[PDB]
């Protein structure tokens, strides 16, 4: 085993699992999913005695069951339900990398609305709805709404979070520290427009979001991390085990 030494010992045998995923979405103004996928990886950080043979089980076999379009593993994994078998390297390492496209849970729905008022103003209203347990909080949310290049100024009203028109980025950036599942918030903005060449219209870029939620958008769930060390005198039940899920947006755009 060239990725793990032979006399490792710890009085506190413990492991931490990280299911990190980036969820990507391209949605129409309608609300139809034009494209969507999750890319994720499971990082394991373990302080286990000896040369443990572990078993990683998740809700594969495709209650809760998800489909994996594809995935690669760390060399320590023994290819051939059919779960993962390995003698992990010590410390932190990437156990596997995977991709999903089906039954993804979109944590946010963005519903935009624009009204043209003459040739002088644009009235914009954007509502965001969190789609996930109420007991879970999202954080680091950011909703970026593009403004036309002939913008002379912007007025915004938002009860939750803080929004700032950024003229150099040609966008109103709305930030929200935390937001629980099954909620709804909105921002209204009035975009003040300068005169422009009447022929060339505005090709509205998509509104885009950023956020971080504590669960895997793919649906993945860790069921168990079994540790067997036949030589040393600690077993599976002696091991303290934790898991955390950090799902973050990648490209999460909504055409408006």
């Amino acid at each position: 085993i060239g990725w793990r030494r032979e006399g490792i010992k710890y009085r506190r045998n413990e492991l931490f699992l990280d299911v990190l995923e980036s969820v990507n979405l391209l949605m129409s103004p309608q609300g139809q999913v034009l494209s969507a996928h999750v890319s994720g990886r499971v990082v394991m950080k373990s302080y286990l005695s000896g040369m443990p043979e572990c078993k990683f089980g998740m809700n594969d076999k495709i209650k809760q069951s998800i489909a994996i379009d594809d995935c690669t593993f760390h060399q320590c994994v023994r290819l051939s339900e059919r779960s993962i078998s390995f003698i992990p390297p010590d410390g932190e390492f990437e156990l596997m990398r995977y991709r999903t496209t089906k039954d993804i849970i979109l944590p946010f729905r963005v519903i935009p609305l624009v009204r043209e008022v003459g040739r002088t103003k644009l009235e914009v209203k954007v509502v965001i709805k969190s789609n996930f347990k109420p007991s879970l909080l999202a954080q680091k949310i950011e909703v970026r709404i593009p403004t036309p290049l002939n913008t002379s100024g912007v007025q915004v009203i938002c009860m939750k979070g803080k929004a700032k028109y950024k003229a150099s980025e040609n966008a109103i950036v709305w930030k929200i520290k935390r937001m629980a599942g099954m909620k709804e918030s909105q921002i209204s903005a009035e975009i003040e427009l300068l005169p422009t060449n009447d022929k060339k219209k505005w090709a509205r870029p998509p509104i885009s979001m950023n956020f971080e939620v504590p669960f895997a958008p793919s649906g993945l769930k860790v069921r168990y991390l079994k540790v067997f060390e036949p030589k040393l005198n600690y077993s599976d039940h002696d091991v303290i085990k934790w898991v955390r899920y950090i799902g973050r947006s990648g490209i999460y755009e909504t055409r408006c």
């Binding site: 931490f16 860790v222 168990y224 991390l225 303290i240 085990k241 934790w242 898991v243 955390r244």
Partner: peptide, 6 residues
């Protein structure tokens, strides 16, 4: 946050 895995 981390949660216990039984």
């Amino acid at each position: 946050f981390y949660r216990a895995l039984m």
